[PDB]
Amino acid sequence: TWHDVLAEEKQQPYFLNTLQTVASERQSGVTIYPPQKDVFNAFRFTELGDVKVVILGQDPYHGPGQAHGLAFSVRPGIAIPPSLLNMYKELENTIPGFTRPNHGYLESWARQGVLLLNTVLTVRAGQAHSHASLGWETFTDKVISLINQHREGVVFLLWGSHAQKKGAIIDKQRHHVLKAPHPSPLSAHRGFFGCNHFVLANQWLEQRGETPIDWMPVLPA
Amino acid sequence: TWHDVLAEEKQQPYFLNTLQTVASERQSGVTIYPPQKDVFNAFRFTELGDVKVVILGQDPYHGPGQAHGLAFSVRPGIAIPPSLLNMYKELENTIPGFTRPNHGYLESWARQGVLLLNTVLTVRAGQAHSHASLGWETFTDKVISLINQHREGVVFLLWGSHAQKKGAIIDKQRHHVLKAPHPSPLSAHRGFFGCNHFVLANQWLEQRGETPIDWMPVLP
Amino acid sequence: QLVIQESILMLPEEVEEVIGNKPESDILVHTAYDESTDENVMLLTSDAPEYKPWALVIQDSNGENKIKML
Amino acid sequence: QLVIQESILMLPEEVEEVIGNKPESDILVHTAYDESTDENVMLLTSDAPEYKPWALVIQDSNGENKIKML
């Protein structure tokens, strides 16, 4: 249970190196993003066995104080990013329970079994997709396989040709795999906003009797 | 072992609920078939490491006293079902070593490494394919996968577009995968009886030095 | 009476290949064998939980088929 | 000034589907949102480490795109 896809992967050279090459860059002078304290939050807020839904994201936010370990989620005061803002549009429209929060902190979803995984875990301040050759993908690829191996009935919310498809060949009848275009404004319209991923993803849980997910953010301390 | 991940699967909620949902139904008033005592016989009579051949079947016989856990196999006195009867004709003709017994009890094949797996493990008396929404498929799917994962050189005897194809994407390199129409009378003639699955299966098993299989039934 | 001994699930194509007409969904081949006349009585019905009759096929000792749509 | 809030990587096909022109490699959709005019300013560049400008697309409150090739 993360002492599975971790016990030996975390000893394997590829991931062993990805860590230090990041560490050096840090002390070497470059400010790398998700503070080494936050790098592994995804696995913290949601355990292997609790993974009810899985949302794939690319690499962390490269601006100051935005990223904190969870994909899409920003800190309690940062401006809601275009895609998270859009995910909200879909929500306030699809789930009639709702209304929108006032921030982009999604830790609430996190502790409700929604795994918010980035395929690349770190980024250089100001340089998008800069750490995309260290080994975060091969580790993150491991993670998905394991979820696909040791788990049943997980919903994979795959957005964008990059996350869906390409980095997501899951057992279609061991897990639910919903696909759709990226929430990004250069894409959300003309083809995304019509999907009902959030409602569907809850619809199939009650179906299995599993307790559904509350997509209404919140804001702890 | 079968204590090979079946250990994990068996705790997975889906395989916990498929059990109880079947349990309730039982004590709730409905007579579900393969008495619990028999439900898993296929894994008992043939172990993972012994699986020389694999024959896929659908769901158990929904009539009284027919099924006992093995696919196609009936108990020591029940009428030989049409499909098993046909399987016999192919055999009676293909393998010049045997004749035909006078029963459909196939445990003999079972203890010789022939895995007779139904994709769905239970059924309601008189209601065919009634339990096909509980979760036996997904469990059974795991099972084939594992045989394909931890095993090498297994013959998969797949009959009928449902068993072959549909529920059967095995690495056709590491394993032998013969296909053919279902022995059902509404099909056996229309292009099945010509295949030589039993002889070929032994042909392979033999080409690897492995001890072949005796397709001639027998009583315990 | 008419004891059905087995019920095999087939797909539209397998059945069309035999019947000459294509079933709009999965078919259940319900077979009742006849020791004596050496006949196989088959009742093709839709899949569970309807079992709505689709076709009736009578087959003799040497495989000739006497089909009739229901 | 112009604060880019996110940078999404897309493939030639996904961008062709919107732009009407096909980028010759991965594209990075750099987005800066404007609370007020309710506009999304998007800078499409090549992938790291060049960030060679490809196109500029302005989108309004109801999704109309004002594209411009760089």
Swiss-Prot record, chain B:
Record key words, sorted: Cytoplasm, DNA damage, DNA repair, Hydrolase
Annotated compartments: Cytoplasm
InterPro entries: UDG_fam1, Ura-DNA_Glyclase_AS, Uracil-DNA_glycosylase-like, Uracil-DNA_glycosylase-like_sf
Entry GO CC: cytoplasm
Regions annotated as coiled coil: none
Pfam families attached to this UniProt entry: UDG
One Gene Ontology term from the biological process aspect of the record: base-excision repair, AP site formation via deaminated base removal
Predominant place of localization: cytoplasm
EC number(s) reported in the record: 3.2.2.27
Reaction(s) this enzyme catalyzes, per UniProt: Hydrolyzes single-stranded DNA or mismatched double-stranded DNA and polynucleotides, releasing free uracil
Domain of life where this protein originates: Bacteria
Active-site feature positions: 59 (proton acceptor)
Catalytic EC class: hydrolase
Molecular function (Gene Ontology), one example: uracil DNA N-glycosylase activity
Subunit structure: Monomer.
PANTHER family hit by this protein: URACIL-DNA GLYCOSYLASE (PTHR11264:SF0)
Family according to the record: Belongs to the uracil-DNA glycosylase (UDG) superfamily. UNG family.
Function according to Swiss-Prot or TrEMBL: Excises uracil residues from the DNA which can arise as a result of misincorporation of dUMP residues by DNA polymerase or due to deamination of cytosine.
Name of the protein in its database record: Uracil-DNA glycosylase
UniProtKB/Swiss-Prot annotation, chains C, D:
Paired cysteines (S-S): none
Domain of life of the organism encoding this protein: Viruses
Signal peptide: none
Function: This protein binds specifically and reversibly to the host uracil-DNA glycosylase, preventing removal of uracil residues from PBS2 DNA by the host uracil-excision repair system.
Protein name: Uracil-DNA glycosylase inhibitor
Lineage, uppermost ranks: Viruses, Duplodnaviria, Heunggongvirae, Uroviricota, Caudoviricetes
Range of the intact protein held here: 15 to 84 of 84
